[PDB]
Amino acid sequence: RASEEQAIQRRLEALRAEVAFVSTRERKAQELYRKLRDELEELRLEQA
Amino acid sequence: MPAITTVHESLPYIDPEPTPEQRAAAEALIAEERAKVPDDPYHALLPPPLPPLNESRHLTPILQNELARLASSPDPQAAKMDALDFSRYEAPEMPSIDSSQSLEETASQLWETLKQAYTAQAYLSARRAHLALLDTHGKNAWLIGNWHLEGEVKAVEKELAETKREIDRVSLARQGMQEAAGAELKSLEETWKAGVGRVLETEAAAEKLRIEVLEERRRLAEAQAALAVGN
Amino acid sequence: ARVREELATALYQHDAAVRVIARLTRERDEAREALARLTVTGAA
Amino acid sequence: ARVREELATALYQHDAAVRVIARLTRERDEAREALARLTVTGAAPAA
Question: In which family does this protein belong, per the annotation (chain A) (predicted)?
Fold first, then answer.
């Protein structure tokens, strides 16, 4: 039970770190998509 | 108190039960790791070995000799020691006094037989006195002994029941904590997998948008080059 | 009694380590299969 | 004596299991880091 409590705390910390990394990757992907949409709008405005 | 302090990420009440094939693969990996490096007989977790019979502070040399004799027997459970002379306590029969036997030898044999008979009679009188004391106090002695044995058995049963109840309470608390942690971790892992898939989809959309933007930039550069050439 | 308690603790730790190794092997196999499928597919 | 021998064997098996679990955890962490940092490159067709 003591080992399971320690392992549960460690696994919760590791899962929180992995979820934070996945959320950071998703935020970076969203920022890249927004930048690509802005660049496409700028290119369409420049071409027209 | 146990000296095991290793921590392994195991959640029996939360994680799924491994299959027999998975357990066999884990055992094979453990056996490969055990064959990778030699075992340490001087491990700190392993306790010290038992000392010898001569090196024991509590074992006497006679006890050491008895232990060696018991270990030398092929069957230690059936290793029965030699009994004492119990035939001397029986009824002494009349000795066969031969006609050629001397008077002194016959007198010595008769004296030995009389001494054996007197010892047997004293033992029989002691047995009769002990039987009289048993007939006097046996009900009280048996009742007291049975009450003491029942009390000891009840105390042992109460201690075992208390230990089992404590183990059950600890198991229930560990199961509840593991179930809550496993539910939280399963939600977090599903969210992480969904976020990975969404990030992959967003990156694919960004790659398609970047390809379209590169095509538009190439078209604009070609138009600018054509306008520069035609001017 | 001390040796039996240590052996019981070692057996419990070995069972927990076997379960953890099985879970880690399953997770690593799933990650490798996902990486192989992502490399094979290409389109997300 | 038999319990001491069994305890020594169990300690050796537990050390082996700990080493194997550490190796498997390192491999799984490497695979998870590769999958998480897997930036989707431009899937250009084979021209």
Answer: Belongs to the CEF1 family.
**CA–CA distance, B115 with B95 (Å, rounded to integer):** 13
Q: Which of B178, D20, A6 is nearest to C17 (CA)?
A: D20
CB contact under 8 A, A26 and B195: yes
Q: Does D3 contact chain C (CB < 8 Å)?
A: yes
Do residues A28 and B197 make contact, with C-beta atoms less than 8 angstroms apart?
no
One-letter amino acid identity for C14? H
DSSP secondary structure, B72-120, as one string:
HSS-SSS-PPPP---GGGSPPPPP---TTS-HHHHHHHHHHHHHHHHHH
CA distance D25 to C20: 9
Instruction: Give SS3 for B206.
Output: helix
CA distance B74 to B199: 74
Under a CB-based contact definition with an 8 Å cutoff, are residues B47 and D4 in contact?
yes
Q: At what angle do helices A2-47 and B103-230 cross, to 10 degrees?
A: 10
**Which residue of D3, D19, D33 to mutate against B (max B Cβ within 10 Å)?**
D19
Q: Which chain C residues are Cβ-neighbours of D11 within 8 angstroms?
A: 10
d(C-alpha A43, C-alpha B188), whole Å = 40
Taking CB atoms and an 8 Å cutoff, what residues of chain C touch D25?
24
